[PDB]
């Protein structure tokens, strides 16, 4: 992926981090295992105003070195090839060939 | 579909527009680049120019449209036939 796409991604996460507390509490109001009527509706409208990016569903997992949006792995971070690369040269602590 | 416990979702920009329109009896088409909203009882009889991707299709909200979203009434693909 291009450098620009990585720049857009870090902006998405940064905006979500700043409003993380507000989103957590606001959604709590909208539920409370069945809550109010008007209060609930106002909370919904507030979330709308609230910058889209701030939503944690607006982030795409990308390689921390290249930004590839596909083939990501939570564990080991990196990406498909990137894992290998580090593991292959001997930077990953423990990976090797599996012959079970 | 959307959960019943959360009620209907409407965009505030469109929502603000209809408020002004109803208190003044405006008949001009409502310009909107959004389709995620739902049809409200207070928009009955208005004409809304719903974007489809390149242009805004005017849709006249009727009584039977209550409860549906704006998106179901704005086809996005232009398809005539394969022959």
């Amino acid at each position: 992926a291009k450098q620009s796409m990585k720049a857009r991604e870090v902006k998405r996460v940064a905006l979500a981090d700043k409003y993380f507390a507000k989103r957590a509490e606001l959604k709590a109001i909208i539920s409370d295992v069945n809550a109010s009527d008007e209060d609930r509706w106002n909370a919904v409208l507030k979330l709308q105003t609230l910058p889209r990016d701030s939503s944690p569903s607006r982030q795409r997992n990308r390689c921390r070195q290249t930004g590839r949006p596909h083939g990501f792995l939570r564990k080991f971070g990196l990406s498909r090839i990137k894992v290998r690369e580090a593991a292959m040269r001997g930077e990953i602590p423990g990976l090797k060939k599996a012959s079970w | 579909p959307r959960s019943l416990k959360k009620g209907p979702f409407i965009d505030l920009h469109l929502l603000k527009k209809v408020e002004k329109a109803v208190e003044s009896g405006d008949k001009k088409p409502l310009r909107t680049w959004s389709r995620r909203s739902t049809i409200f009882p207070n928009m009955i009889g208005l004409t809304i120019a719903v974007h489809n991707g390149r242009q805004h299709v005017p849709v006249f909200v009727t009584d039977e449209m209550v409860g549906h979203k704006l998106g179901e009434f704005a086809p996005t693909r232009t398809y005539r036939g394969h022959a």
């Binding site: 009527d37 | 009584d63 449209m65 209550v66 409860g67």
Partner: peptide
């Protein structure tokens, strides 16, 4: 009908 009647009862109407 019902399109509005349904909306009325189903949603709290805030």
């Amino acid at each position: 009908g019902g399109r509005v009647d349904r909306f009325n009862k189903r949603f709290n109407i805030p």
